[PDB]
Design a protein around this ligand. Structure first.
Ligand SMILES: N=C(N)c1ccc2cccc(N)c2c1
Ligand code: NA
Length: 246
């Protein structure tokens, strides 16, 4: 997250921290995710497509820092790694950038909701917020594009939704951004999601209820003029989520 502010997991209790164990035992942060039900974390396929071994991953819930065991946190293994069959990546655009992680503790249990571990509601069909709506993003992603390390403390920011017509403008992304994708950015281009924030939530308050409107997918650089963050439009994939979580 470029700009924004430092936060803690109590303010984003659906946020999942996904790590990968490497050969030799080193563990590195991969992507963010969202708890949509006690057994299921939703993220982006591009986070896992090159290493699609469910055994390689570690999932934390209720974790506020990259290298601290936050009080009340829960650690999980991935029981099932479901990647969207029609995923593909162009130079910029990521297609069907959605994944499901069925989580299981070493005892074989799913998440136990607490004050710091909660689910995020899914959106309803054909009911996304209008352009200009302020939405929040959360992640352990880069604070600056030139950084090579990720911030130790969880960050959050607020961005505004951009219409598909505006995002398809030539100086924006042209025909590369599709109707299955949602753009969001800062009108002043100072705050944004960045590398490392992928898979993380774009949460919008709609009709008084907070919902998982988007999943951090792609963008040209970070917080660059006319280059919004691009998110998987979760409302399009509701038949796919429902069928793959049964
Ligand atoms: N500009 C963005 N919001 C954005 C979002 C996700 C990204 C993922 C990998 C690399 C980037 N530069 C990204 C930028
Ligand atoms: Na690390």
């Amino acid at each position: 997250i470029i700009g924004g502010e430092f936060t803690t997991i109590e303010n984003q209790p659906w946020f999942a921290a996904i790590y990968r164990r490497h050969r030799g035992g080193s563990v590195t942060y991969v992507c963010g995710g969202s708890l949509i039900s006690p057994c299921w974390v939703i993220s982006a396929t591009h986070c896992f497509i090159d290493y699609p071994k469910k055994e390689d991953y570690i999932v934390y819930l209720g974790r506020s820092r990259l290298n601290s065991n936050t009080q009340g946190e829960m650690k999980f293994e991935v029981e099932n790694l479901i990647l969207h069959k029609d995923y593909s990546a162009d130079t910029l655009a990521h297609h069907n950038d959605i994944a499901l992680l069925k989580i299981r503790s070493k005892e074989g249990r799913c998440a136990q909701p607490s004050r710091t571990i909660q689910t995020i509601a899914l959106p309803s069909m054909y009911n996304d917020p209008q352009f200009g709506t302020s939405c929040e993003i959360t992640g352990f992603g880069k604070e600056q594009s030139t950084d090579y390390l990720y911030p130790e403390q969880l960050k959050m920011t607020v961005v505004k939704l951009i219409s598909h017509r505006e995002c398809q403008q030539p100086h924006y992304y042209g025909s590369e951004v599709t109707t299955k994708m949602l753009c969001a950015a800062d009108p002043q281009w100072k705050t944004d999601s960045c590398q490392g924030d992928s898979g993380g939530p774009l949460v919008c308050s709609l009709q008084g209820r907070m919902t998982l409107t988007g999943i951090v997918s792609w963008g040209r650089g970070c917080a660059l003029k006319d280059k919004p963050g691009v998110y998987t439009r979760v409302s399009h994939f509701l038949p796919w989520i429902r069928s793959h979580t049964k």
